[PDB]
Amino acid sequence: VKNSIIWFRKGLRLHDNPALLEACKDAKHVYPVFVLDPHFLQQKVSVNRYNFLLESLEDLQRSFQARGSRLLVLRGKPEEVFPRVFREWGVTQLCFEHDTEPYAKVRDAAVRRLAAEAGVEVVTPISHTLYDTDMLVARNGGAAPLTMQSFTKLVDRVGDPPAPAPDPPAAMPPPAEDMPSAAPAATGVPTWQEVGFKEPPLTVFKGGETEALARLEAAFQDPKWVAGFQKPDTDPSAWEKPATTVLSPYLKFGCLSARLFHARLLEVYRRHPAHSQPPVSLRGQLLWREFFYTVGSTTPNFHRMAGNPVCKQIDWDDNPEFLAAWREARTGFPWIDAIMTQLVTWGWMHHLARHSVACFLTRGDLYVSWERGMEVFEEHLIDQDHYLNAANWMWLSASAFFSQYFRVYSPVVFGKKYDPEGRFIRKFLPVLKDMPAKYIYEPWTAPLEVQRKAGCVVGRDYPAPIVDHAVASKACIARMAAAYRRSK
Ligand SMILES: Cc1cc2nc3c(=O)[nH]c(=O)nc-3n(C[C@H](O)[C@H](O)[C@H](O)COP(=O)(O)OP(=O)(O)OC[C@H]3O[C@@H](n4cnc5c(N)ncnc54)[C@H](O)[C@@H]3O)c2cc1C
Numbered sequence: 322v323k324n325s326i327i328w329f330r331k332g333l334r335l336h337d338n339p340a341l342l343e344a345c346k347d348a349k350h351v352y353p354v355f356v357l358d359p360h361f362l363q364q365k366v367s368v369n370r371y372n373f374l375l376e377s378l379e380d381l382q383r384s385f386q387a388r389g390s391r392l393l394v395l396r397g398k399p400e401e402v403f404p405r406v407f408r409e410w411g412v413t414q415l416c417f418e419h420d421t422e423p424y425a426k427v428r429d430a431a432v433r434r435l436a437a438e439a440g441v442e443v444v445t446p447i448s449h450t451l452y453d454t455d456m457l458v459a460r461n462g463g464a465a466p467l468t469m470q471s472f473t474k475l476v477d478r479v480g481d482p483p484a485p486a487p488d489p490p491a492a493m494p495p496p497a498e499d500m501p502s503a504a505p506a507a508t509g510v511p512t513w514q515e516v517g518f519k520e521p522p523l524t525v526f527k528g529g530e531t532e533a534l535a536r537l538e539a540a541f542q543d544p545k546w547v548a549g550f551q552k553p554d555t556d557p558s559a560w561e562k563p564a565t566t567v568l569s570p571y572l573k574f575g576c577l578s579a580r581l582f583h584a585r586l587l588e589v590y591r592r593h594p595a596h597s598q599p600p601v602s603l604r605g606q607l608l609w610r611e612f613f614y615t616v617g618s619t620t621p622n623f624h625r626m627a628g629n630p631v632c633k634q635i636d637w638d639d640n641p642e643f644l645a646a647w648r649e650a651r652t653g654f655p656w657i658d659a660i661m662t663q664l665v666t667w668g669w670m671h672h673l674a675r676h677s678v679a680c681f682l683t684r685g686d687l688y689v690s691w692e693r694g695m696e697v698f699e700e701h702l703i704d705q706d707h708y709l710n711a712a713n714w715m716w717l718s719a720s721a722f723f724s725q726y727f728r729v730y731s732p733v734v735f736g737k738k739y740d741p742e743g744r745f746i747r748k749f750l751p752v753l754k755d756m757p758a759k760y761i762y763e764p765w766t767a768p769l770e771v772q773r774k775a776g777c778v779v780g781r782d783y784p785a786p787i788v789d790h791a792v793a794s795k796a797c798i799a800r801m802a803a804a805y806r807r808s809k
């Protein structure tokens with residue numbers, strides 16, 4: 322008989338899951354498995370992203386229970402768990418979504434060898450990304466395109482991505498009963514308190530495939546907005562109803578299939594001939610994800626500066642004081658501090674909000690390495706993606722892809738163009754709630770009487786600005802100009 326395991330790592334969903342469809346085919350028993358490291362926090366990860374994963378697994382558990390099955394959260398490392406459960410469950414086939422991250426390739430290689438020793442067939446379909454990323458490289462002459470414009474001409478020569486896979490059957494072959502490694506008390510989904518966290522999650526975005534689909538349909542309720550979407554024209558100060566889809570955490574964990582997203586976009590585009598085109602369109606945003614995935618998977622040391630063949634080597638400063646002030650939202654610039662407060666509270670900010678804080682920390686003001694800001698983003702972001710977080714930090718620091726280091730966002734003027742009353746600022750920084758809008762972006766310019774009437778004295782309730790933007794930015798520009806000249 323055929324007994325199979327569908328191993329969840331990403332792809333935390335039942336829709337468009339070719340690995341699950343293959344695991345169920347002609348199977349007598351199916352073991353849906355997620356491997357959890359109970360010593361993860363005793364190693365970096367916020368409760369917001371880890372609870373988002375737990376809610377995603379809880380959503381999987383209900384979906385499996387609704388089809389006569391059950392999700393098994395096995396404790397331990399995969400190289401030690403699978404050799405046992407291969408023999409105990411009589412497994413003949415192992416199925417999991419292909420992953421191109423560096424750690425994934427080492428882990429998957431090791432598991433593949435253990436599977437061959439136990440006589441277990443391994444099927445690893447591609448469905449995290451739109452395309453087979455190795456096929457795009459092979460189609461482009463053996464090297465990944467380094468520009469979005471050339472990357473778009475490649476995907477247009479390849480054609481549409483594969484259709485989303487059909488849904489699994491209404492009933493699924495259940496796990497075998499009374500197997501010791503499948504005991505319910507040792508395979509349940511843990512809560513955020515049980516994995517070690519002490520502070521509760523504060524984010525407003527709930528995890529799981531069900532939430533991902535409901536947010537997808539909400540984005541498509543207005544097909545004209547989808548068709549006319551232009552990323553650079555969206556509002557970073559909008560928080561009550563964010564100006565973009567906020568599908569990034571679900572695409573990161575695979576709660577939403579990118580191919581389903583892409584297939585829905587094409588339906589709307591066929592009916593609205595004036596729809597926006599890449600790179601600004603909503604399809605263009607999925608292409609940025611694919612573009613960065615294709616470059617980064619074929620570039621060694623992509624997440625670092627040294628040894629990265631595509632990253633500029635810049636003499637970033639080792640200023641721990643500037644980094645701590647930026648990390649703890651006490652720079653003295655309310656627009657910067659409000660975004661960094663949203664980072665720790667929600668785990669998600671609008672793309673241009675991330676532009677503001679990343680330019681400020683790196684090539685704009687503090688001249689700290691993009692790797693340091695990256696480490697802070699990887700801790701709190703619920704959409705934390707190894708390749709996207711890398712490439713966008715190298716973009717914002719003018720270390721890769723982007724080179725116009727003379728374009729420097731003002732931490733005073735940028736948000737003021739969207740939100741002159743500072744509603745975004747008062748939301749996330751309630752200490753400035755009573756500050757009049759004339760000084761909300763520049764509280765140190767307010768007279769002492771106004772600061773006292775609003776109960777926010779600069780240097781007592783809210784910190785004074787750590788740098789003068791006009792002085793700091795001119796220095797960063799002069800130094801970036803020399804870094805782009807000394808190289809060749
Ligand atoms: C410094 C910095 C760090 C970032 N780190 C991450 C990260 O860790 N994870 C992440 O998902 N995105 C990251 N981004 C990209 C961008 O911030 C988010 O993808 C976007 O803000 C998510 O909101 P959304 O889903 O509403 O985007 P939408 O505008 O709705 O775009 C839809 C989808 O397209 C993809 N996408 C959009 N913009 C980009 C982009 N610039 N690069 C790659 N994919 C994109 C995402 O999968 C997103 O869900 C980063 C950008 C910056 C400037």
Ligand SMILES: [Cl-]
Pocket residue numbers: 729730731734735
């Ligand atoms: Cl500006």
